[PDB]
Every structure is written in C-alpha cells, then in structure tokens.
C-alpha cells in the first residue's frame, strides 16, 4: 500500500498551508504575554534553558582566532523577549526582534525594561515573509519557532538568514526534535521534526554545521531539544 510507517516531511502532515499559518497566528493571539506563555507551561525551566544557551553561545564569542562579533543579534520568533532579556542583551550591544504577534512585541517594551532601550528594531512579521538585512547580524537566534514554518519556507528563511550574517557570524536553531518522523500538533498548528529532517533542511539552505548539542536537564515528558550552530 501507499501509507508509510511514518511521515518525514511537512507536506505529508499539513493539509492546507494557508490554514496552517492562520490557525497558528490565532493560537498565539490567545496566549498570555508572559514567560510561562512563551514556554507553554514550562516557565519553571527558563533558567535551565538560558544558562545552557549562554554556555553554547559563549564558545563562539569568547574562543578561537575567528570570534563571532557582539555588535548585533537578531532574535527570531522572539515573543516578549525572554531570550532577548537574559541571553542576548547582556552579550550584544544591539538586538533586533522579529515576531508575528504584535502584542508580544508591545509587551517586550515593558518586559525588557531599561536594557530594552538597546533593542533597535521590533519587526512584526512572519518568518516566512521576513528578509533579514544582508550583512547585518553577528548572531541570528531562532528558538522554539521552526515548527511553525513549512519545509520550503524554513529552507528559504534559513538561506535568507545566511546572507544576513556578518563575518564570523552564526545562526543558531534551538528547538524541539522528534524521536522519529514529522509530528503535527493541531492545537498550536506546528510540527516537530526529527534530527534527520532538520539536517536535510539545514543542508538545503546551504548551511554548514558548527555544533550540535542536546539540551540536558529538561522535563522528562517533553520532546528532546537541540541547538545547532550554523553558517
């Protein structure tokens, strides 16, 4: 028969792309603009996430003969700025945020406080329609949002990101990874892809892998989380 043991691409699980995006936008409009909202009930592990991210990122900023710069970072799917506040603003002179949900960007101005004055651009845009400026960012940080893009949109978005990197710049993807295949969450309208699927998409964007690390110390019941450094 034609029905495979499992799916391995978004075209196998997404019935209608327009509805996939519109349902996701509606979902996020209804979420409280809080850390626990950003983390789907896992606000209590925000520090575990941030501290591991900092260690992951610092190697690129502090070590080697070709250090990644600290002039400008872009936080993708930034929400209210959980990551911008504790990871990026303390490390970069300037940060831009991009998110589809304007109310989160509005909340960010309050959430980020005084240090938020160093957030330059608040881009309200879906990643699928967003073009980061060429030769502009030292670090493009993409976390807990890749499941909201189709495979074609994710591949193209990553390709646009590559052109946006400054010399020695990197893209970091940190996100849920499925044990096997591609799994649809029809409640928030997103997918979770396995490591192989994500590797294929990274390759198709013309990106090279610099580091790949599984997040330790997370809740037992959740999908595994991986960080990929790319350029």
């Amino acid at each position: 028969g034609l029905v495979p043991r499992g799916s391995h691409m978004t075209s196998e699980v997404i019935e209608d792309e327009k509805q996939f995006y519109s349902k996701a936008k509606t979902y996020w409009k209804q979420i409280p603009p809080t850390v626990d909202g950003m983390l789907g009930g896992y606000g209590h592990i925000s520090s575990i996430d941030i501290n591991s991210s900092r260690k992951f990122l610092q190697r690129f900023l502090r070590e080697g003969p070709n250090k990644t710069g600290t002039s400008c970072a872009l936080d993708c799917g930034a929400g209210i700025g959980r990551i911008t506040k504790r990871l990026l603003l303390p490390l970069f002179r300037e940060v831009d945020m991009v998110d589809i949900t304007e109310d989160f960007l509005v909340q960010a101005k309050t959430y980020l406080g005084e240090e938020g004055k160093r957030v330059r651009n608040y881009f309200c845009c879906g990643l699928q329609d967003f073009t980061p400026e060429p030769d502009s960012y030292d670090v493009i940080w993409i976390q807990w949002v890749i499941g909201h893009l189709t495979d074609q949109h994710l591949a193209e978005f990553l390709r646009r990101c590559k052109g946006s990197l400054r010399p020695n710049g990197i893209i970091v993807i940190k996100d849920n990874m499925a044990q096997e295949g591609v799994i649809l969450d029809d409640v928030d309208s997103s997918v979770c892809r396995d490591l192989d699927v994500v590797r294929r998409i990274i390759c198709s964007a013309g990106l090279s892998l610099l580091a790949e690390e599984r997040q330790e110390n997370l809740p037992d019941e959740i999908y595994h989380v991986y960080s990929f450094a790319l350029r």
């Binding site: 807990w144 979770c192 019941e221 959740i222 999908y223 989380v225």
Partner: peptide, 8 residues
C-alpha cells in the same frame, strides 16, 4: 514552546 512528546 517545549511540549509533551505524548504517549510512548
């Protein structure tokens, strides 16, 4: 967000 992987 981080989320349950569901049933084993």
């Amino acid at each position: 967000x981080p989320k349950t992987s569901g049933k084993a």
